[PDB]
Design an enzyme around this catalytic site. Sequence first.
Site, short mmCIF file in Angstrom:
data_model
loop_
_atom_site.label_atom_id
_atom_site.label_comp_id
_atom_site.label_asym_id
_atom_site.label_seq_id
_atom_site.Cartn_x
_atom_site.Cartn_y
_atom_site.Cartn_z
N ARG A 175 1.29 -1.69 -0.22
CA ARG A 175 -0.06 0.12 -0.62
C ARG A 175 0.29 1.50 -0.11
NH1 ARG A 175 -5.51 0.34 1.65
NH2 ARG A 175 -4.66 1.75 3.30
N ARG A 179 10.17 4.66 -2.75
CA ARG A 179 10.93 5.11 -3.11
C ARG A 179 12.43 5.90 -3.22
NH1 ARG A 179 6.41 8.46 -1.87
NH2 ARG A 179 4.35 8.86 -4.00
N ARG A 256 -9.79 -5.67 12.60
CA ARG A 256 -9.33 -4.80 13.22
C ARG A 256 -9.83 -3.90 13.11
NH1 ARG A 256 -5.49 -6.29 17.01
NH2 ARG A 256 -4.39 -4.12 17.03
N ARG A 287 -1.25 7.14 15.50
CA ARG A 287 -1.23 7.76 15.22
C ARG A 287 -1.62 9.26 15.57
NH1 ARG A 287 -3.33 6.01 9.10
NH2 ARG A 287 -4.93 4.45 9.92
N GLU A 312 -5.85 8.09 17.59
CA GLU A 312 -5.74 6.86 17.10
C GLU A 312 -5.36 5.38 18.04
OE1 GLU A 312 -6.61 7.28 12.66
OE2 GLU A 312 -6.23 4.57 12.54
N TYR A 363 -8.98 -5.21 2.30
CA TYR A 363 -8.80 -3.75 2.92
C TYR A 363 -9.02 -2.80 2.08
CZ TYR A 363 -5.37 -1.62 5.21
OH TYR A 363 -4.61 -0.13 5.83
N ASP A 365 -9.78 0.67 0.13
CA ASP A 365 -10.27 2.36 -0.06
C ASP A 365 -11.26 2.92 -0.57
OD1 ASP A 365 -7.96 2.31 1.22
OD2 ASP A 365 -6.47 2.42 -0.70
C1 LIG Z 1 -9.45 3.99 9.51
C2 LIG Z 1 -10.25 4.32 7.71
C3 LIG Z 1 -9.14 4.81 7.27
C4 LIG Z 1 -9.48 5.17 5.84
N1 LIG Z 1 -8.39 6.62 4.82
C5 LIG Z 1 -8.83 5.75 3.74
C6 LIG Z 1 -8.32 6.92 3.45
O1 LIG Z 1 -7.33 7.84 3.55
N2 LIG Z 1 -8.48 7.38 1.67
C7 LIG Z 1 -9.47 6.21 0.94
O2 LIG Z 1 -9.51 5.94 0.09
N3 LIG Z 1 -10.49 5.25 1.73
C8 LIG Z 1 -9.99 5.07 3.04
N4 LIG Z 1 -10.72 4.38 4.25
C9 LIG Z 1 -11.53 3.43 3.56
C10 LIG Z 1 -13.24 3.27 2.97
O3 LIG Z 1 -13.54 4.38 4.37
C11 LIG Z 1 -13.16 2.74 3.19
O4 LIG Z 1 -13.25 1.22 2.06
C12 LIG Z 1 -15.19 2.86 2.48
O5 LIG Z 1 -15.93 3.59 2.75
C13 LIG Z 1 -15.70 0.65 1.97
O6 LIG Z 1 -17.11 1.35 1.56
P1 LIG Z 1 -17.44 -0.11 1.68
O7 LIG Z 1 -19.20 0.77 1.91
O8 LIG Z 1 -18.12 -1.12 1.76
O9 LIG Z 1 -17.79 0.33 3.97
P2 LIG Z 1 -18.25 0.60 4.98
O10 LIG Z 1 -18.32 1.91 4.93
O11 LIG Z 1 -17.68 0.46 6.39
O12 LIG Z 1 -20.04 0.38 4.59
C14 LIG Z 1 -21.26 -0.01 5.28
C15 LIG Z 1 -21.92 0.96 6.05
O13 LIG Z 1 -23.52 -0.13 5.93
C16 LIG Z 1 -24.18 0.08 7.29
N5 LIG Z 1 -24.49 -1.61 7.65
C17 LIG Z 1 -23.73 -2.76 8.71
N6 LIG Z 1 -24.45 -3.13 8.48
C18 LIG Z 1 -25.70 -2.61 8.69
C19 LIG Z 1 -27.20 -2.95 8.62
N7 LIG Z 1 -27.18 -4.22 9.33
N8 LIG Z 1 -28.34 -2.77 8.00
C20 LIG Z 1 -27.95 -1.86 7.67
N9 LIG Z 1 -26.50 -0.98 7.63
C21 LIG Z 1 -25.81 -1.54 7.72
C22 LIG Z 1 -22.67 0.36 8.23
O14 LIG Z 1 -23.43 1.57 9.08
C23 LIG Z 1 -22.08 1.12 7.39
O15 LIG Z 1 -22.64 2.22 6.83
C24 LIG Z 1 -9.81 3.81 5.12
C25 LIG Z 1 -10.98 3.19 6.48
C26 LIG Z 1 -10.80 3.77 7.60
C27 LIG Z 1 -11.36 2.81 8.35
O1 LIG Z 2 4.40 4.06 9.69
C1 LIG Z 2 3.19 3.07 9.13
C2 LIG Z 2 2.75 2.89 8.65
C3 LIG Z 2 2.27 1.90 7.94
N1 LIG Z 2 3.03 0.40 8.23
C4 LIG Z 2 2.27 -0.82 7.53
O2 LIG Z 2 1.60 -0.47 6.06
C5 LIG Z 2 0.35 -1.03 6.52
C6 LIG Z 2 -1.01 -0.42 5.91
O3 LIG Z 2 -0.45 0.87 6.16
P1 LIG Z 2 -1.49 2.90 5.78
O4 LIG Z 2 -0.59 3.62 6.05
O5 LIG Z 2 -1.78 2.44 4.53
O6 LIG Z 2 -2.83 1.83 7.21
P2 LIG Z 2 -4.08 2.74 6.76
O7 LIG Z 2 -4.19 4.06 6.31
O8 LIG Z 2 -5.14 1.40 5.77
O9 LIG Z 2 -4.64 2.05 8.60
C7 LIG Z 2 -0.13 -1.27 7.96
O10 LIG Z 2 -1.25 -1.67 8.70
C8 LIG Z 2 0.82 -1.30 8.67
O11 LIG Z 2 1.29 -2.29 8.84
C9 LIG Z 2 3.79 0.72 9.21
O12 LIG Z 2 4.47 -0.53 9.54
N2 LIG Z 2 4.06 2.03 9.52
#
Ligand SMILES: Cc1cc2nc3c(=O)[nH]c(=O)nc-3n(C[C@H](O)[C@H](O)[C@H](O)COP(=O)(O)OP(=O)(O)OC[C@H]3O[C@@H](n4cnc5c(N)ncnc54)[C@H](O)[C@@H]3O)c2cc1C
Ligand SMILES: O=c1ccn([C@@H]2O[C@H](COP(=O)(O)OP(=O)(O)O)[C@@H](O)[C@H]2O)c(=O)[nH]1
Lengths: 385, 386
Positions: A175, A179, A256, A287, A312, A363, A365
């Site tokens: 991910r 570079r 997780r 972080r 976090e 996993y 995005d």
């Molecule tokens: C900490 C974190 C950081 C992230 N950072 C980035 C980023 O920087 N850039 C990026 O591109 N992506 C990022 N992502 C990813 C992004 O959040 C998800 O990949 C995206 O929201 C996925 O879409 P989804 O619909 O599959 O998931 P979800 O958003 O999880 O869809 C689930 C939804 O369905 C609902 N639901 C679940 N069960 C039920 C039920 N039984 N009845 C009714 N409703 C229900 C939930 O409430 C929820 O609203 C990040 C994710 C996390 C956790």
């Molecule tokens: O400082 C860092 C950043 C990332 N990671 C590893 O790289 C994975 C993906 O990193 P990202 O920054 O993509 O994590 P997210 O934002 O998806 O939680 C993490 O789960 C860690 O295992 C790490 O070890 N150290």
Amino acid sequence: SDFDLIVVGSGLFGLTVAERAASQLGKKVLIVEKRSHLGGNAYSEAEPETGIEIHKYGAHLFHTSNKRVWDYVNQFTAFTGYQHRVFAMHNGTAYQFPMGLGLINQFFGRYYTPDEARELIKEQSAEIDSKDATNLEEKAISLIGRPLYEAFIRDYTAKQWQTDPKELPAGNITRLPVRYNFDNRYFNDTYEGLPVDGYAQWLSNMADHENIEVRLDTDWFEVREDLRAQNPEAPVVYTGPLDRYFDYSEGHLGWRTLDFETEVLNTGDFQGTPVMNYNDAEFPYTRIHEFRHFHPEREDRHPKDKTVIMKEYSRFAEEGDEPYYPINTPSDREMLFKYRELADAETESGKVYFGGRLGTYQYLDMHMAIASALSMFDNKLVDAL
Amino acid sequence: SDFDLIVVGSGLFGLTVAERAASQLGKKVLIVEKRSHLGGNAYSEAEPETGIEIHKYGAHLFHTSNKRVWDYVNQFTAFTGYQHRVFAMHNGTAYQFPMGLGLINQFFGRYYTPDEARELIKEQSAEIDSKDATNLEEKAISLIGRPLYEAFIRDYTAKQWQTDPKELPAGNITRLPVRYNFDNRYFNDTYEGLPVDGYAQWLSNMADHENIEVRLDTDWFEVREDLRAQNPEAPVVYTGPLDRYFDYSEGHLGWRTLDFETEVLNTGDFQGTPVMNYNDAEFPYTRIHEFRHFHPEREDRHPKDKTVIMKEYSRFAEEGDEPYYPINTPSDREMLFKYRELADAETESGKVYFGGRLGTYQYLDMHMAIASALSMFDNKLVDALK
Ligand SMILES: Cc1cc2nc3c(=O)[nH]c(=O)nc-3n(C[C@H](O)[C@H](O)[C@H](O)COP(=O)(O)OP(=O)(O)OC[C@H]3O[C@@H](n4cnc5c(N)ncnc54)[C@H](O)[C@@H]3O)c2cc1C
Ligand SMILES: O=c1ccn([C@@H]2O[C@H](COP(=O)(O)OP(=O)(O)O)[C@@H](O)[C@H]2O)c(=O)[nH]1
Ligand SMILES: Cc1cc2nc3c(=O)[nH]c(=O)nc-3n(C[C@H](O)[C@H](O)[C@H](O)COP(=O)(O)OP(=O)(O)OC[C@H]3O[C@@H](n4cnc5c(N)ncnc54)[C@H](O)[C@@H]3O)c2cc1C
Ligand SMILES: O=c1ccn([C@@H]2O[C@H](COP(=O)(O)OP(=O)(O)O)[C@@H](O)[C@H]2O)c(=O)[nH]1
């Protein structure tokens, strides 16, 4: 009634599939959402005391190289020119990050040219080739060498996963851009930015179509038995947790979860950057987010002497937690297969499709969720409508 | 009278005033350029062996917060999304630069918080208040403190100006952002980028009008008597050196000039960034440019195992040289005032206007040359061409 489609979940996966049916096929869709808001984890809202836009569900930074996905999302919101950069805190020093000449200079004590740096990392990574790496640890060392691994990957991963780096997926570490220049952008995608009017506004505009009605605060597993009796007409897209769909018949999938502790501080600037990674074991959080820095174009509207930060934390998902990440150990991946059989079986027997991060135990995005949603719509939902 | 307006010099300033007279007032313009190409120091061309665009007069990076200037230049070229960052080589280490938390961490050895960094630099800058700082050395120390000054400003400045920093303008150092966060952008403007099709194309588009004729390889002072016989009506906009215009009647203004060693290297990447400053006296050049990194969007057209670099050297301008920078010591500012008087008289007497970096002896960036020219056109030349 009169509903052509039922979507379980109002996250990005759920919203795209619904929006496509509504405006491309003119079909009336209803989305059932469990939460009090639309958007899933992409949701954001202003902090009461400072007015600063907060990702209450984790820093959300949109990036993609998919032109089709980019043009699509740009229908619902404009994006700022923000480019994500991350610094990594280790032994009292903030390191340029991810691996580049900057981190290499800082960590090894002097400037290495691109050629010299390629040679340095070639030597330290010799113990395993990238072709022979089957997990996170082998892959990381293969890409960045032993010392950088032990200093910047080991403890962090331990905090983030609480799992042996030898059984976590290699794809987790790929991910990150690797570079041999001074480019320290955290992503390497063609398009990226943040919703100009904030995430919440973006996600609502998506659901804003008149063939779409959203029923919030509603649990699918409760209302399903009658609702799809009221409408055996409509197919269903399920984006909830897979193992939970089948009542853990095959067991609990490893996930997780994250916790966010928010703190309003009496200073205009806590760390001078949007995200500081904490790579040392002594700090319990992975972080720190300082949200005012996600929108420097809103400087005039941010308080001059306050800031909101968020620490976090990572732990195993317990029943009652929102699962955020699949863990995908080999032990997990077996259980996963069994659910996939069940899943396949359900889509023909009961016309229920499984999508999204939770729906497929992947996993993903945001842009990956949207692409995967676009794929399901074009390849499957077009037929079944 | 084939020309309503004569412009001396085809730099951004000259091209701007000529293009406006041409397209806004319908006037026939003549531009005399002394060099073999137009565009002045913003000129660029492809390196033969690699095809990499070279900014032949020193790396040129466009930036502005002036919306009128931005909308204007965008009529003649589109711009990339590139953002300039500079690294500073000091004692064998490449430092994040200009002052930010990155530089402070690297140079002082541990992470300083914004508040801590403010306090640390407040201490190191205590010897002079910014309010009382009247030259480069005083202003630099007031802004970034003595230790950063001595490690990153003193020697570089020595090479670049060869002049007592206590006699250099305070404004030279304030060009650089001074920050207490991790942002290491070298500029802090609203708009910036590179001409998508290169500088040469941009500058040619500006001069491309049927009311405009360009005469290259032509020195104004040689053709002057004849040109001002054939079109005795036309005002002249002069963008050449101010003191040369009056045959150095009041003496020589201090100028700096640059020399460049350009080298094609047998590696795909020499330094992993477009500009590396060499802040140590032990290196004769001030900085090294690696032009391929200015256009990563042209990656597919770049050679995989070759790159072009350019080392930049500074010295005093002597009689045979094109001046690149005004020095503006207090002694220079005196002499300048006298030339300003002459220029004023000349504008009245001979309808000759003075503009641009050389024409006004000012340390002007591209957007400033263009802003000042747009202003001169509206505020002086619309009138003069009525
Ligand atoms: C900490 C974190 C950081 C992230 N950072 C980035 C980023 O920087 N850039 C990026 O591109 N992506 C990022 N992502 C990813 C992004 O959040 C998800 O990949 C995206 O929201 C996925 O879409 P989804 O619909 O599959 O998931 P979800 O958003 O999880 O869809 C689930 C939804 O369905 C609902 N639901 C679940 N069960 C039920 C039920 N039984 N009845 C009714 N409703 C229900 C939930 O409430 C929820 O609203 C990040 C994710 C996390 C956790
Ligand atoms: O400082 C860092 C950043 C990332 N990671 C590893 O790289 C994975 C993906 O990193 P990202 O920054 O993509 O994590 P997210 O934002 O998806 O939680 C993490 O789960 C860690 O295992 C790490 O070890 N150290
Ligand atoms: C190394 C270097 C790097 C720079 N980098 C940047 C940057 O990154 N970003 C930025 O915004 N600005 C930058 N600049 C500034 C930029 O060069 C100036 O803003 C711009 O050149 C000024 O335009 P001008 O028309 O006023 O002057 P000039 O560019 O000097 O144009 C003057 C022209 O008049 C011609 N001329 C002189 N005498 C005669 C004569 N007797 N007869 C006919 N023609 C004559 C000259 O040959 C020349 O073409 C840089 C300058 C240097 C030296
Ligand atoms: O590493 C650096 C960069 C800049 N400067 C000082 O800041 C002035 C302006 O710097 P710029 O980077 O604007 O110089 P240019 O690109 O205009 O030659 C220089 O003349 C020096 O006096 C310095 O001392 N060290």
